[PDB]
Every structure is written in C-alpha cells, then in structure tokens.
Design an enzyme around this catalytic site. Structure first.
Site, PDB file in Angstrom:
ATOM      1  N   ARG A  47       0.571  -1.443  -0.121  1.00  0.00           N
ATOM      2  CA  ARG A  47      -0.025   0.241   0.121  1.00  0.00           C
ATOM      3  C   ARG A  47       1.101   0.632  -0.105  1.00  0.00           C
ATOM      4  O   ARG A  47       2.059   1.610   0.532  1.00  0.00           O
ATOM      5  CB  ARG A  47      -0.867   0.048   1.313  1.00  0.00           C
ATOM      6  CG  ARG A  47      -1.709  -1.356   1.180  1.00  0.00           C
ATOM      7  CD  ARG A  47      -3.017  -1.016   2.427  1.00  0.00           C
ATOM      8  NE  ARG A  47      -3.687  -2.066   2.961  1.00  0.00           N
ATOM      9  CZ  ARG A  47      -3.183  -2.964   3.014  1.00  0.00           C
ATOM     10  NH1 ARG A  47      -2.377  -3.807   3.470  1.00  0.00           N
ATOM     11  NH2 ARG A  47      -4.518  -3.954   2.926  1.00  0.00           N
ATOM     12  N   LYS A  78      -1.658  -0.654   8.115  1.00  0.00           N
ATOM     13  CA  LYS A  78      -3.222  -0.649   8.078  1.00  0.00           C
ATOM     14  C   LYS A  78      -2.988  -1.853   9.042  1.00  0.00           C
ATOM     15  O   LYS A  78      -4.620  -1.802   9.568  1.00  0.00           O
ATOM     16  CB  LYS A  78      -3.431  -0.422   6.747  1.00  0.00           C
ATOM     17  CG  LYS A  78      -5.604  -0.533   7.159  1.00  0.00           C
ATOM     18  CD  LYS A  78      -6.193  -0.471   5.518  1.00  0.00           C
ATOM     19  CE  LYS A  78      -8.088  -0.404   5.371  1.00  0.00           C
ATOM     20  NZ  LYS A  78      -8.181  -1.196   4.756  1.00  0.00           N
ATOM     21  N   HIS A  83      -4.076   3.487  -6.069  1.00  0.00           N
ATOM     22  CA  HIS A  83      -3.342   1.807  -5.562  1.00  0.00           C
ATOM     23  C   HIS A  83      -3.824   0.987  -5.925  1.00  0.00           C
ATOM     24  O   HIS A  83      -4.039   0.115  -5.772  1.00  0.00           O
ATOM     25  CB  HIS A  83      -5.280   2.059  -3.986  1.00  0.00           C
ATOM     26  CG  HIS A  83      -5.380   1.719  -2.706  1.00  0.00           C
ATOM     27  ND1 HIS A  83      -4.334   1.371  -2.529  1.00  0.00           N
ATOM     28  CD2 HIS A  83      -6.571   0.113  -3.129  1.00  0.00           C
ATOM     29  CE1 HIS A  83      -5.086  -0.064  -1.999  1.00  0.00           C
ATOM     30  NE2 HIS A  83      -6.165  -0.114  -1.488  1.00  0.00           N
ATOM     31  N   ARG A 132      -1.960  -1.736  -6.208  1.00  0.00           N
ATOM     32  CA  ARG A 132      -1.704  -3.374  -5.724  1.00  0.00           C
ATOM     33  C   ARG A 132      -2.778  -3.893  -6.023  1.00  0.00           C
ATOM     34  O   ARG A 132      -2.069  -5.284  -6.067  1.00  0.00           O
ATOM     35  CB  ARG A 132      -2.256  -2.853  -4.343  1.00  0.00           C
ATOM     36  CG  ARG A 132      -2.613  -3.847  -2.783  1.00  0.00           C
ATOM     37  CD  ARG A 132      -2.612  -3.040  -1.768  1.00  0.00           C
ATOM     38  NE  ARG A 132      -2.621  -3.926  -0.927  1.00  0.00           N
ATOM     39  CZ  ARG A 132      -2.544  -5.021  -0.495  1.00  0.00           C
ATOM     40  NH1 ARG A 132      -1.246  -4.636  -0.523  1.00  0.00           N
ATOM     41  NH2 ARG A 132      -2.633  -5.544   0.831  1.00  0.00           N
ATOM     42  N   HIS A 176      -2.190 -10.869   4.225  1.00  0.00           N
ATOM     43  CA  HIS A 176      -3.287 -10.773   5.060  1.00  0.00           C
ATOM     44  C   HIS A 176      -3.306 -10.987   6.111  1.00  0.00           C
ATOM     45  O   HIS A 176      -2.443 -12.547   6.561  1.00  0.00           O
ATOM     46  CB  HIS A 176      -4.295 -11.952   4.494  1.00  0.00           C
ATOM     47  CG  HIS A 176      -4.873 -12.015   2.800  1.00  0.00           C
ATOM     48  ND1 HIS A 176      -3.676 -11.587   1.899  1.00  0.00           N
ATOM     49  CD2 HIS A 176      -5.892 -11.088   2.560  1.00  0.00           C
ATOM     50  CE1 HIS A 176      -4.476 -11.395   0.714  1.00  0.00           C
ATOM     51  NE2 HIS A 176      -5.671 -11.057   1.344  1.00  0.00           N
ATOM     52  N   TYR A 230      -8.878  -8.645  -4.063  1.00  0.00           N
ATOM     53  CA  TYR A 230      -7.491  -7.734  -5.657  1.00  0.00           C
ATOM     54  C   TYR A 230      -6.993  -8.835  -6.702  1.00  0.00           C
ATOM     55  O   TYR A 230      -6.774  -7.811  -7.324  1.00  0.00           O
ATOM     56  CB  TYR A 230      -6.170  -7.344  -4.572  1.00  0.00           C
ATOM     57  CG  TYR A 230      -6.388  -6.882  -3.094  1.00  0.00           C
ATOM     58  CD1 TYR A 230      -6.521  -6.601  -2.585  1.00  0.00           C
ATOM     59  CD2 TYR A 230      -6.051  -5.266  -3.682  1.00  0.00           C
ATOM     60  CE1 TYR A 230      -6.862  -5.475  -1.422  1.00  0.00           C
ATOM     61  CE2 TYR A 230      -5.749  -3.910  -3.330  1.00  0.00           C
ATOM     62  CZ  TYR A 230      -6.546  -4.249  -1.684  1.00  0.00           C
ATOM     63  OH  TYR A 230      -6.554  -3.111  -1.407  1.00  0.00           O
TER      64      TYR A 230
END
Length: 280
Positions: free
Chosen positions: A136, A159, A232, A235, A257, A266
């Site tokens: 990110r 994040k 973004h 990604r 994750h 994604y």
DNA sequence: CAATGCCAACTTT
DNA sequence: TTTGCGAAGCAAAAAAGTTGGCATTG
C-alpha cells in the site's frame, strides 16, 4: 436530550475504543454530517431517510450507507444510557453501493508510466516499486533502506500490523520490472533515508504520490468506465500479475492478510476482461 | 511558477 | 480487509486511499 448535545456525548464515547487517529476522524466526519443534516430535537424515521435519500440522491451511496451505520450506533448507545427506546434508524433502508473504481491493466500501466515521463523521477520509481512489492502507498512511503536486510525488505503494514519479508530477488515479467534493479535506481537517483524520497531527498507523503500518479493518468489521456483507476489500483495489478506469473498463494502472502483466508478481492478482474465495443 | 503539506468530504478495502 | 453473527454469506467495524482547494516556500 437533544440530538446535538447527545452527539457530543457520543463522540466522547467513540474517543475511547482504542480507535486509531484516522478512524476517529472518519467517524467524526460522519457525525458532523448528521449535525448539518438533522435538527436539535429530542425524540423521525422519515426525517432520517430524508437525509440519507438526500445522499443517495446525488449519488453518494457510500456516504449514505456509512452515515446510516454511524447514526444507528449512536442510537444504540443512546438507548443503552437510557435516553431513547427506539432505534428509528433500523426501520430505514440499508443503501446499496458498488465500487465504481475501475481496475488497471498491464497495458494501461505502461501508458501512464510513459505519461509520467513529465513528472519527478520518484513517481515512475514509486510506480515500479508499488507494482513489484504489492504494498500500500502508505507503507511504500515508510520503507527506509534500513528495512532491507540480506535480500529481504521487511514491512510491517501500517493499516493491519501484518509483518512480512519481501525478497528483493523479485521481479514482474509481464512488465519487465526487477526489484533489485528498481531499488538500485532508487538509491542512486533519489538517495534518501526512505527508499522513496522527494526532490529534496526528504520523505514523501502517500497523499502526494497518489496525487502525482493521478496527474500522470489524466496526462496519458486514457478513457475508463466508471471512476478512473488510482494509485491504489497498482496493488491489485501487482496481485493479478503475480497470480499468473507464480501462484495465487504467492499473491496472497505478498498482499498480506491476517486471516490466512485466501478469499481476496485484489485478485478480482472486475470486468476488465470484457471489451465493451466503442461505436466510432 | 511548482513542489508539497493540510483539511475535507467522498469512496475502498 | 477483517470481524461479527450466525453457521452461508452480507452488514458493520476499523483504517485506508482519493483528490479539490488553499496556503507555503524552494
């Protein structure tokens, strides 16, 4: 009480929870919207949907659904402390919102990359790193050279807290990007404490990177369906390439994750496969 | 001028 | 995405990213 005075009590509540600064801000902005949108009366279901439909009216469905949620929670808190007894928000319709942002393709990337030839060098370098590492922007602007150790770029995603080690021997074939090659160019051409530095060898802000990527997009003059692709979107581009070049499993880990659940969106193409025929 | 940061109000993940 | 509540899959929670407009300073 009065709605407003209670909203003030509600935000002090929110201030707890352990919520991160940005999160609090998001919530505050939803509460500020409720203010402008509703009176100071005590107690309205139709009065509420009046506001919400007013957002869905000008196509701000995302906001509508987000406001509705915050309003409802504020109400459950009010019912808890015993100020109201009914959650007149529950009797309202949950608005439907679909991501309008279009996915970016390998070819589109090459055109934006050229169009970026009129931008600072860090842009194009930032774009290459973004795609080869699948990280990110917020994290990309944090990467310091001290983070590389024995062929691995350590990253603690901001994040989510997820911690991963990215091997520098990496490279994307479909686009001809070598991570080591990119990193070198980053050390030489940019030279800063952060792998992505500004014209003054200082740290960049994700906001700026995003913004310059956006300029270059318009500059490329490409056309898109629905809201245009944003930085973004690299990604997802990264993921979708690596899926084909290596494996879904690999792409999952790169993205990072907690879940260990390979659900992932994604990897979704979101229609880019389809070729909507023009009409010259 | 032009590169950047900051606040804001939206949309995404 | 990740969590939650109910047990399959959406809705909500938490934390971003996007980008116009204003202000600042090399």
């Amino acid at each position: 009480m009065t709605l407003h005075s209670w909203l003030d009590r509600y935000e002090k509540i929110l201030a707890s929870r352990g919520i991160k600064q940005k999160t609090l801000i998001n919530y505050m902005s939803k509460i500020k919207a409720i203010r402008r949108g509703l009176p100071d009366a005590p107690l309205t279901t139709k009065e509420i949907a009046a506001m919400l439909n007013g957002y869905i009216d000008e196509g701000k469905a995302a906001s509508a659904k987000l406001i509705r949620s915050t309003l409802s929670d504020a109400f459950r808190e009010a019912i808890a402390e015993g100020h109201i007894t009914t959650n007149h928000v529950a009797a309202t319709r949950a608005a439907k919102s679909e991501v309008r942002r279009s996915r970016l393709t390998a070819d589109e990337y090459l055109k934006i990359y050229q169009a970026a030839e009129s931008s600072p060098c860090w842009l194009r370098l930032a774009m290459e790193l973004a795609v080869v590492t699948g990280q990110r922007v917020g994290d990309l602007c944090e990467m310091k050279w001290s983070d590389i150790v024995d062929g691995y770029l350590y990253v603690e995603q901001s994040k989510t807290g997820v911690k991963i080690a990215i091997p520098t021997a990496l490279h994307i074939d479909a686009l001809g990007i070598s991570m080591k090659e990119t990193l070198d160019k980053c050390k030489e051409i940019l030279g800063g404490e952060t792998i992505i530095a500004s014209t003054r060898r200082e740290p960049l802000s994700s906001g700026t990177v995003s913004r310059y990527f956006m300029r270059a997009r318009k500059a490329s003059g490409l056309s898109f369906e629905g809201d245009p692709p944003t930085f973004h979107e690299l990604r997802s581009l990264s993921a979708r390439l690596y899926e084909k070049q290596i494996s879904d499993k690999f792409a999952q880990h790169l993205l990072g994750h907690k879940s260990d659940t390979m659900a992932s969106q994604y990897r979704d193409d979101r229609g880019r496969e389809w070729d909507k025929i023009e009409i010259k």
